[PDB]
Amino acid sequence: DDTITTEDCWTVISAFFEEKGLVSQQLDSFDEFMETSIQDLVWEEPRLILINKRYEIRFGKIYLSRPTMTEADGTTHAMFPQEARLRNLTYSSPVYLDMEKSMFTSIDGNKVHIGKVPIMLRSKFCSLRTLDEVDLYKMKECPYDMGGYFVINGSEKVLIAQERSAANIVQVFKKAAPSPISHVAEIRSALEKGSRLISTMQIKLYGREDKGTGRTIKATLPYVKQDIPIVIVFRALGVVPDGEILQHICYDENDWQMLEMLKPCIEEGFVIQDKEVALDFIGRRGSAALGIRREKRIQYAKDILQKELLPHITQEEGFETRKTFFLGYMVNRLLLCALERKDQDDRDHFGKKRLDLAGPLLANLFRILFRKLTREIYRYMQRCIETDRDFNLNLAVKSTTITSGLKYSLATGNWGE
Amino acid sequence: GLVCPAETPEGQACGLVKNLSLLSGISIGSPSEPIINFLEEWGMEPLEDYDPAQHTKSTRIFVNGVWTGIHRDPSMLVSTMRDLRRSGAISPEVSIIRDIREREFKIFTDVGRVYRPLFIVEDDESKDNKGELRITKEHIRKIQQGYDDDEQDVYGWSSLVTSGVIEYVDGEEEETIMIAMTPEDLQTRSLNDTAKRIKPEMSTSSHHTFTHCEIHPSMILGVAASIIPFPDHNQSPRN
């Protein structure tokens, strides 16, 4: 027919704004949180432990009701945001968890209330979604309102998006002149499930130009100081011969400059020959021990290589091939940046940054509060056992800690206890 | 196109507080298992049987920041995954990046990625409509009607997105695409008007191959900056 005009572009933009709106990100994040994150958090640790009288518990489905208001008279009624604003109340809905006892004489539907989660207005669990214009006017709510905010103590609270650096990526930077380290490679590790940061690992290239004696490359892991040179950790992951080391690091044999730069690493690491001696050296330099004999050293080294060493890749034994391949790729990137072939990564690049909305922050807060509640209920059940009494499974749970924590965090803004 | 270039506070918060653009969005997060299944079905080789002696030209494939394997035909895989994303089988908020210089294939399904929508320009040489917008007047008519010509469904923004005419791109993917500011820039114009502004010559390249087109440049502004009449005739501190 004809080319696309400006009016067609404005029609497309109008369709975009009609379907999504202006505060679509807030509502989408909160809906995803309330739909998936709560269930994921409660199923993350569904095993609470304490014939061999194996007392077991089960965490079941999570049930959400409409935001209800309960008073001193005990009557519970449906509550709307206007009433909460007028009476300085909190717009929240109760959460029910299927805490089931599975005693079952050892090896040979309770709907327990766990707290009240504040409800974002105009979100899928709010009461103002399917309500039409006439009833919106009836409920003293402006139809022009867009939602996307909570109501705490009759005050409207909005969660500002939090800008952070992206995790599970490798970034290489330079260093100032008065420092032995010339270039640095950094990665922040966070597993996909929950998107929580565990630990960070940092690879450094010691040795300024015409200085620093040996130009060794040293890794820095969590749960350890006295950073270990990278060749020893290569040998510790289970790759003994040096030819395989250079094959992992350098993917092109024609790059003689990379091999020449890597030669000091081989010269320094020649003192270590086998995997066991490298593991023992790591255990001796691994802290968290002081003369605790060789077996504990090798056990701690096995734990620190299987876990906390790039946990975002894997956390189980027998799968160290991809771990050492990623580590070799990281070393190759660091050496490429050091060889003045690739420019250092820009920290201001907006594509390497993430925005935490209400979803992830509420997920982390709920995880912390659930951990605190589990600790409190564990203390209560152990006290009940040591006092030789039978609990009703309903007085042990304290919804007050979760409710108060969420309310205080949202009201004050201090994201913590 | 992701944050407002004009709206920012003054003082200790200058530059540290930003406002999202009108078309800007935030990724929610999608499972990565279907991506891995599609990659394995399309001939991706794992790292267990990686031989660097023979795989000196194979491109590495990164999913959510981890190295999952290698491939020998990056172009076909990239085209197939882009087509699958444009057809709605893959979530539209999935970032697909092909670094030709570094020989890398990055796939991102993380949460918190900021993306904006853009028109899609035909890229394949076999197609007769190469160099033109995939969206035609039929799509505009269907949008205005509110239904597809076949009540049963609604023809809105999602219908346009799943039809392969509008796609979301984030900051990382933007380095791998060529964008035309206006649809009139998609056709090489063949006067001497003293009133209208002068467009850039863009004569440094003999031929241009645009892969995307902006819906409207004024969408790069924020909510507060959209109130200013004629912001392009002002000074930026005044905005």
Added chain:
Amino acid sequence: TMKEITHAISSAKEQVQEIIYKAQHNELELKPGMTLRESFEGEVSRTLNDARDSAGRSAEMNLKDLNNVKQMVSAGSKGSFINIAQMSACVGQQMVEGKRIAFGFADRSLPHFTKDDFSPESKGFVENSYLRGLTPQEFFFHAMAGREGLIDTAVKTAETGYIQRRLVK
């Protein structure tokens, strides 16, 4: 006068293209104590600044005695030559941290340009005036320059205040 300004801008763009051609073929003269890229950037910046000054001079010479902006400038109450130049002839080259607009993306300032583009319009040159309006790329570059200026003023005020207090004490 508009025709003269456009002719001057076109001649300057042709000179910048010639400088680019000379630099890409190892023909540009090396300044003492400076890198080739630094010398090329300095040459381009000087040419663009001279073009902006010439366009502003032509615009100021065209102004009539009854012009109100010229009356304000002559009185000295408000305004200057640069204000008239930017309002009528050309905004000029936008500079951030003393240099042109850097390549924030992969070897390009914006995704609407090709890689390794050193033309003025691709590195923060606003050839239009405020009366004529600004293209979106020029608008973004002007916003970047204004943000840099605001940040510089904000960081300068506190240091100046502390220095003044120390001197007084």
Added chain:
Amino acid sequence: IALDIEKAKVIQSSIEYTTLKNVTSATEIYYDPDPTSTVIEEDFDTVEAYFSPWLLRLELDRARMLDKQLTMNQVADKISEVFSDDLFVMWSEDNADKLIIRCRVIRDEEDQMLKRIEAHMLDLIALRGIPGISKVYMVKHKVSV
């Protein structure tokens, strides 16, 4: 001096600090089985006319060699006097296409100390000029007299 550009240029060249690293372009370690000759044919004529099997080879840059207005005799004498007679030196004239000045450790596995000596030569050796002066520029000053 101020009225003569040539004398000002000479003094400017004298003031500027120039070291061995500022002119050396590449360094090599070679194994020379015979002191009388050499394996390479480029310096075969040089070693034939001018006459631990390890040797140090230095290759310079012609443009940067002439930029500092330095000859081979000057740098050869400097490297000879800086190390006394603890390192034999064989220096070639401008006739050699490759700007080669070879060094041999004095006999009295030697890779580590030889590399240390080469690093010392690359870093600490200074030919002429006031230390600490990175660059010198000629400025035209207009004064009233």
Added chain:
Amino acid sequence: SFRFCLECNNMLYPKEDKENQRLLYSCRNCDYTELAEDPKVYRHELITNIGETAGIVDDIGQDPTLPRSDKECPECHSRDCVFFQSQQRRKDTNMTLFYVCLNCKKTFRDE
């Protein structure tokens, strides 16, 4: 590029042998040695121009960001080609252009 061992897979080192005054590549992990015919062992250049060719791949022809020109190809005389600059991030890198054709997908400079 230094040769590696055969049984323990370790890179070898130069060593001098006196009864035949020969340079040989030796291993300290084991007792494997071989003859060395190259006195060229150490290379360190202060200023280099190696790496300007960049990592060009056969898939570089469909990159849309690269500018397109109409330079004359040496052997096929094609009118379609792309151009870019050196990948080296050195401060004193020259601005000489690198051209890659499309029919043969090979590089050629202005020389």
